[PDB]
């Protein structure tokens, strides 16, 4: 008895943004709060989106106070604006920060409380405000997830908030908005997409449904991600990566992740490094730790990342996945180890301990000890 949670309406493809208003009109929206970063508000994309929405008889207001690593303070600022403007819907424009902020605003405005009071897994009881998420990056997949991560203000800890009700109501994935992404950013986000697909395939809670999307995501990523890193104007590469991010997000949201994300959450937060790059640096060693758990699947992954496994044993084909991960990492210039990125040995223990406590660690195919995590990070320190 497994649950499958996906946005009931998704528009994916060139020009998809042009349908925000249309989509909000079907949900029956009267007025929408747009949540974005200050920069996108300066680019004018927020204004174009608001125009489209208002054309469909849906009023709009803007909350350009989203920041990277969203915080409860701004979440509640946005709930305040929601109430003052008398909004009935939320629309998010940007990366994961915008999306998670919007989801938290909706949760608190419908069921009340502090977003602090929603840490952990929740079964909120009130009807929740619809959220329409427009993605501008090909990674994260937050337009399809039931998870928002908000940082506590006082305690400087991050809080995961999981509920089937924050699962966005409309997901708009337009590749055209992703074209001006620089090459390094494309690398980071695409490697996080690959991270999602690989972790979902070997996840403890993988269903055949999750595996469908995960496998197709690995196929599409393997072909076009280098092409999108090479020429960002290649709209076909951008479109295949858009679909790949979507499928990978659904896959990990319902199936699960693991130590890759657990480790890189701590490493990135502490050392202020990019999510995708940390994920890519530690994935080859995490998968080695996980090899005994899902051997057949890691052989399949080696084949899906583009290796000739014919005439190989399932153990050999499994290890070829690690070889492929290092091949990809070398092609996109991922750092050689964590040490280059500034990780200090004296911190590993902490990084391990906190990573042991992450919600992601529970879906990892191999049950870990704090020392297992520590040894993973140590092996990832330098090549």
Considering the rule CB under 8 A, would residue 376 count as an interface residue with a copy of itself?
A: no
Rg (alpha carbons) of the chain, rounded to whole number: 20
Question: If you count them, how many residues does the chain have?
Answer: 383
Q: Residue 76 and residue 104: Cα distance in Å, rounded?
A: 9
CB of 298 to a copy of itself, least distance (A): 12
Q: Where does this chain touch a copy of itself (CB under 8 A) — which range of 46-54, 67-75, 344-352, 362-370?
A: 362-370
Q: Where does this chain touch a copy of itself (CB under 8 A) — which range of 49-57, 105-113, 265-273, 285-293?
A: 285-293
Of the pair 72, 239, the CB lying nearest a copy of itself is at 239
Cβ neighbours of residue 16 under 8 Å, at least 6 residues apart?
Answer: 172, 173, 174
CB of 296 to a copy of itself, least distance (A): 9
Q: Residue 157 and residue 150: Cα distance in Å, rounded?
A: 9
Could you tell which of a copy of itself, Mn ion, none binds residue 192, using a CB distance below 5 to 8 A set by kind? Mn ion
Q: Where does this chain touch a copy of itself (CB under 8 A) — which range of 2-10, 97-105, 267-275, 341-349?
A: 2-10
CB of 262 to a copy of itself, least distance (A): 16
Q: Which of residues 88-127 bind a copy of itself (CB under 8 A)?
A: 127
Quote the longest CA-to-CA distance of the chain. 67
Residue owning tokens 């427009």: 134
Of the pair 267, 360, the CB lying nearest a copy of itself is at 360
Residue 303 C-alpha from the chain's centroid? 24
Q: Residue 250 and residue 255: Cα distance in Å, rounded?
A: 8
CB of 371 to a copy of itself, least distance (A): 11
State whether residue 220 is helix, strand or coil.
helix
Whether 52 contacts 17, CB under 8 Å? yes
Could you tell which of a copy of itself, Mn ion, none binds residue 342, using a CB distance below 5 to 8 A set by kind? none
Of the pair 26, 42, the CB lying nearest a copy of itself is at 26
Whether 323 contacts 285, CB under 8 Å? no
Q: Where does this chain touch a copy of itself (CB under 8 A) — which range of 60-68, 106-114, 239-247, 339-347?
A: 239-247
Cβ neighbours of residue 190 under 8 Å, at least 6 residues apart?
Answer: 138, 139, 221, 225, 228, 229, 241, 244, 276
Q: Which two tokens stand for residue 198?
A: 């690989």
Whether 133 contacts 170, CB under 8 Å? yes
Binding site for a copy of itself (CB under 8 A): 1-16, 18-19, 26, 28, 127, 164-165, 167, 169, 183, 204, 207-209, 211-213, 215-216, 220, 226-227, 229-233, 240, 243-244, 246-247, 290-293, 295, 306-308, 310-316, 327, 331-332, 365-367
Binding site for Mn ion (CB under 5 A): 192
């Amino acid at each position: 008895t497994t649950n499958f949670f996906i946005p009931p309406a998704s528009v994916i493809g060139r020009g998809a943004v042009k349908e925000v208003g249309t989509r909000l009109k079907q949900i029956g929206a009267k007025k929408a709060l747009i949540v974005t970063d200050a920069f996108l508000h300066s680019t004018g994309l927020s204004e174009e989106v608001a125009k489209n929405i208002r054309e469909a008889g849906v009023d709009v207001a803007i909350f350009p106070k989203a920041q990277p690593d969203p915080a409860d303070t701004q979440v509640h600022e946005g709930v305040d604006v929601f109430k003052q403007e008398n909004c009935d819907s939320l629309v998010s424009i940007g990366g994961g920060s915008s999306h998670d902020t919007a989801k938290a605003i909706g949760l608190v405005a419908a069921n009340g409380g502090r977003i602090n009071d929603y840490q952990g897994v929740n079964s909120v009881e009130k009807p929740v405000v619809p959220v329409v998420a427009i993605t501008t990056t090909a990674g994260t997949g937050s337009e399809t997830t039931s998870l928002a991560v908000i940082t506590d203000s006082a305690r400087k800890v991050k809080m995961p908030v999981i509920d089937e009700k924050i699962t966005p109501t409309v997901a708009i994935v337009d590749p055209e908005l992703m074209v001006k992404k620089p090459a390094g950013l494309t690398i980071a986000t695409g490697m996080d997409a690959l991270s999602h697909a690989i972790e979902a395939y070997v996840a403890k809670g993988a269903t055949p449904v999750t595996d469908a999307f995960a496998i197709q995501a690995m196929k599409l990523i393997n072909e076009y991600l280098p092409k999108a890193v090479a020429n960002g104007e290649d709209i076909e590469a951008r479109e295949k990566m858009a679909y790949a991010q979507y499928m990978a997000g659904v896959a990990f949201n319902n199936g699960g992740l693991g130590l890759v994300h657990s480790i890189s959450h701590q490493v990135g937060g502490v050392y202020k490094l990019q999510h995708g790059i940390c994920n890519s640096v530690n994935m080859p060693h995490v998968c080695a730790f996980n090899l005994i758990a899902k051997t057949e699947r890691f052989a399949h992954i080696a084949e899906l990342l583009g290796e000739n496994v014919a005439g190989l044993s399932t153990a050999a084909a499994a290890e070829r996945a690690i070889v492929a991960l290092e091949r990809i990492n070398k092609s996109f210039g991922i750092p050689s180890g964590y040490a280059e990125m500034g990780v200090k040995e004296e911190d590993i223990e902490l990084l391990a301990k906190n990573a042991y406590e992450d919600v992601c660690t529970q879906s990892n195919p191999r049950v870990p000890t704090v020392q297992d995590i520590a040894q993973i990070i140590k092996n990832a320190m330098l090549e």
